[PDB]
């Protein structure tokens, strides 16, 4: 609703006050914060990549790259 304010303010010939644009900027980041953390995610080992002698139970030799 802060971001809403900014968007509709020009309808009424109006510049949104500073504190508002600030709070909108701030708010919009926070919406995505927890999502951004979710979307981090490391990709798996590559098509190649040896399996590793230390790793027991061979399963798919080398690395799965798909699993």
């Amino acid at each position: 609703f802060h971001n809403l304010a900014c968007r509709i303010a020009p309808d009424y010939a109006l510049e949104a006050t500073a504190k508002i644009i600030a709070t909108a900027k701030y708010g919009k980041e926070l919406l995505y914060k927890q999502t951004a953390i979710s979307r981090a995610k490391r990709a798996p080992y590559p098509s190649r990549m040896p399996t590793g002698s230390g790793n027991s139970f061979p399963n798919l030799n080398e690395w799965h790259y798909f699993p």
């Binding site: 990549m49 230390g54 790793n55």
Partner: protein
């Protein structure tokens, strides 16, 4: 996660074994300060045998 095995201990061990494996070392059975010289040969022959 990956676990490689890049040891360096083996080569040492291999070396040590190879050394002891080329210096056989067995039994002897010398006679004794008192006994007759031909004391050992009987036993030794038996030992060597089995």
């Amino acid at each position: 996660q990956y676990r490689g095995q890049f040891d360096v201990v083996r080569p040492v061990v291999r070396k040590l074994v190879s050394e002891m494996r080329q210096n056989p070392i067995d039994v002897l059975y010398r006679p004794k300060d008192g006994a007759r010289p031909d004391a050992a040969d009987v036993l030794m022959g038996m030992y060597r045998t089995d």
